[PDB]
Design a protein around this ligand. Structure first.
Ligand SMILES: Nc1nc2c(ncn2[C@@H]2O[C@H](COP(=O)(O)OP(=O)(O)O)[C@@H](O)[C@H]2O)c(=O)[nH]1
Ligand SMILES: [Mg+2]
Length: 167
């Protein structure tokens, strides 16, 4: 197809749960066991083929520490989509994700598409957040949910593409 679309996406979530790793996997097809902590935010772009449209993603990868919370609106304000990420082995990160969802539903664009990534799914032997519980939470809050693994690539391209399809 000859159509071209572009949209802004922001990743939010407790540090560290794998936000930068998810972006690196999608954008560069790489994964770093030793990933440097993000300071403020980092920016990357990726262009993909979605049916008859060339979709370009402008991605803001935010630093998740609480000291950066006040900067968050600078990144989500004009976003068309967000991926709120938690680590499936860390229940506290899942609770933190729910608070990011609340903040987006109250302060971001009313039409923003919100995805929820249960990351580090490859560490299911250390699971702390039940898949069905997270799915029910996502369904009740109209969030696009998938468990992902930046380490193995499981559902990484899929979650980004599912978002693009719903814009
Ligand atoms: N096993 C596993 N480790 C991961 C995964 N995603 C990220 N990590 C590791 O978790 C650490 C933190 O990842 P990072 O992307 O920096 O987290 P951020 O602070 O949310 O950006 C790094 O050591 C990564 O290699 C994943 O899906 N599986
Ligand atoms: Mg990071």
């Amino acid at each position: 197809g000859n159509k071209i679309c572009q949209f802004k996406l922001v990743l939010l979530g407790e540090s560290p749960v794998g936000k930068s790793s998810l972006v690196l996997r999608f954008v560069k097809g790489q994964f770093h066991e030793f990933q440097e902590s993000t300071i403020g935010a980092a920016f990357l772009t990726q262009t993909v083929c979605l049916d008859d449209t060339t979709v370009k993603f402008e991605i803001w990868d935010t630093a998740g520490q609480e000291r950066y919370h006040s900067l968050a609106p600078m990144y989500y304000r004009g976003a068309q989509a967000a991926i709120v990420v938690y680590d499936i082995t860390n229940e506290e990160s899942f609770a933190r994700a729910k608070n990011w969802v609340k903040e987006l539903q109250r302060q971001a664009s009313p039409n923003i598409v919100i995805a929820l990534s249960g990351n580090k799914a490859d560490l299911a032997n250390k699971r702390a957040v039940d898949f069905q519980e997270a799915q029910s939470y996502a369904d009740d809050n109209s969030l696009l949910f998938m468990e992902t693994s930046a380490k193995t690539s499981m559902n990484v391209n899929e979650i980004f593409m599912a978002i693009a399809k719903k814009l």
